[PDB]
Amino acid sequence: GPIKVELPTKETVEIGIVDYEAGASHGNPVVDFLKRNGSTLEQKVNLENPIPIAVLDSYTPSTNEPYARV
Amino acid sequence: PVMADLNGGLQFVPELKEFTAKLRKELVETSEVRKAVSIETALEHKVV
Secondary structure: OEEEEEOOOOOEEEEEEOOOOOOOOOOOHHHHHHHHHOOOOOOOOOOOOOOOOOOOOOOOOOOOHHHHHO | OOOOOOOOOHHHOOOHHHHHHHHHHHHHHHHHHHHHHHHHHHHHHHHO
Protein backbone atom coordinates (compact mmCIF):
# COMPACT_ATOMS: atom_id res chain seq x y z
CA GLY A 1 0.00 0.00 0.00
CA PRO A 2 0.89 3.69 -0.06
CA ILE A 3 2.46 5.56 2.84
CA LYS A 4 1.55 9.25 2.89
CA VAL A 5 2.61 12.21 4.99
CA GLU A 6 0.29 14.83 6.45
CA LEU A 7 1.16 18.22 4.98
CA PRO A 8 0.61 21.46 6.93
CA THR A 9 -2.72 21.82 5.08
CA LYS A 10 -4.07 18.58 6.64
CA GLU A 11 -3.62 16.93 3.23
CA THR A 12 -2.17 13.42 3.00
CA VAL A 13 0.29 13.12 0.09
CA GLU A 14 2.07 9.90 -0.86
CA ILE A 15 5.76 9.76 0.04
CA GLY A 16 6.45 6.02 0.13
CA ILE A 17 5.15 2.48 -0.19
CA VAL A 18 4.76 -0.36 2.26
CA ASP A 19 5.73 -3.55 0.39
CA TYR A 20 5.98 -6.66 2.58
CA GLU A 21 6.37 -10.10 0.98
CA ALA A 22 6.89 -13.36 2.84
CA GLY A 23 6.35 -17.08 2.45
CA ALA A 24 5.14 -19.31 5.27
CA SER A 25 4.31 -17.12 8.27
CA HIS A 26 2.03 -17.04 11.31
CA GLY A 27 0.99 -13.41 10.84
CA ASN A 28 1.55 -10.11 9.11
CA PRO A 29 4.26 -8.15 10.98
CA VAL A 30 3.30 -4.86 9.33
CA VAL A 31 -0.17 -4.77 10.88
CA ASP A 32 1.18 -5.82 14.28
CA PHE A 33 3.85 -3.11 14.20
CA LEU A 34 1.36 -0.44 13.13
CA LYS A 35 -1.18 -1.48 15.78
CA ARG A 36 1.46 -1.49 18.52
CA ASN A 37 3.08 1.84 17.59
CA GLY A 38 0.62 3.98 15.64
CA SER A 39 -3.07 4.67 16.14
CA THR A 40 -6.07 3.39 14.19
CA LEU A 41 -8.04 6.01 12.25
CA GLU A 42 -11.70 4.96 12.32
CA GLN A 43 -13.83 6.79 9.75
CA LYS A 44 -17.00 5.93 11.67
CA VAL A 45 -17.42 8.25 14.67
CA ASN A 46 -20.05 7.22 17.21
CA LEU A 47 -22.25 9.85 18.81
CA GLU A 48 -22.33 10.47 22.55
CA ASN A 49 -25.60 8.50 22.75
CA PRO A 50 -27.66 6.68 20.10
CA ILE A 51 -30.67 8.50 18.65
CA PRO A 52 -33.60 6.08 18.14
CA ILE A 53 -35.52 6.91 14.97
CA ALA A 54 -38.45 4.48 14.84
CA VAL A 55 -39.58 0.91 15.48
CA LEU A 56 -41.28 -0.50 12.38
CA ASP A 57 -43.20 -3.67 11.53
CA SER A 58 -42.81 -5.59 8.26
CA TYR A 59 -44.93 -8.60 7.31
CA THR A 60 -43.11 -11.17 5.19
CA PRO A 61 -45.26 -12.41 2.28
CA SER A 62 -46.72 -15.90 2.21
CA THR A 63 -45.17 -16.67 -1.19
CA ASN A 64 -41.58 -16.04 -2.30
CA GLU A 65 -42.28 -16.70 -5.99
CA PRO A 66 -42.66 -13.03 -7.08
CA TYR A 67 -39.47 -11.94 -5.33
CA ALA A 68 -37.62 -14.98 -6.69
CA ARG A 69 -38.72 -14.20 -10.25
CA VAL A 70 -38.01 -10.48 -10.02
CA PRO B 1 50.96 28.55 48.17
CA VAL B 2 50.83 26.16 45.23
CA MET B 3 48.18 25.47 42.60
CA ALA B 4 48.54 21.92 41.29
CA ASP B 5 46.56 21.35 38.08
CA LEU B 6 45.76 17.63 37.87
CA ASN B 7 43.14 18.20 35.18
CA GLY B 8 44.64 15.96 32.50
CA GLY B 9 44.37 18.60 29.79
CA LEU B 10 40.59 18.86 30.12
CA GLN B 11 40.83 22.66 29.89
CA PHE B 12 42.17 22.60 26.33
CA VAL B 13 39.01 21.17 24.74
CA PRO B 14 36.78 24.04 23.51
CA GLU B 15 33.20 24.11 24.80
CA LEU B 16 33.72 21.19 27.17
CA LYS B 17 30.13 21.22 28.48
CA GLU B 18 28.62 21.11 24.99
CA PHE B 19 31.09 18.46 23.82
CA THR B 20 30.34 16.26 26.84
CA ALA B 21 26.61 16.69 26.22
CA LYS B 22 27.18 15.71 22.58
CA LEU B 23 29.07 12.57 23.61
CA ARG B 24 26.33 11.54 26.03
CA LYS B 25 23.63 12.31 23.45
CA GLU B 26 25.41 10.20 20.83
CA LEU B 27 25.85 7.24 23.17
CA VAL B 28 22.26 7.41 24.45
CA GLU B 29 20.83 7.78 20.95
CA THR B 30 22.84 4.81 19.66
CA SER B 31 21.81 2.67 22.64
CA GLU B 32 18.11 3.54 22.36
CA VAL B 33 18.06 3.10 18.58
CA ARG B 34 19.74 -0.30 18.81
CA LYS B 35 17.42 -1.43 21.61
CA ALA B 36 14.30 -0.34 19.72
CA VAL B 37 15.48 -1.97 16.48
CA SER B 38 16.32 -5.19 18.31
CA ILE B 39 12.93 -5.26 20.05
CA GLU B 40 11.08 -4.64 16.79
CA THR B 41 13.12 -7.27 14.94
CA ALA B 42 12.35 -9.73 17.74
CA LEU B 43 8.63 -8.97 17.58
CA GLU B 44 8.65 -9.31 13.79
CA HIS B 45 10.40 -12.66 14.11
CA LYS B 46 7.94 -13.88 16.74
CA VAL B 47 4.86 -12.85 14.75
CA VAL B 48 6.27 -14.28 11.50
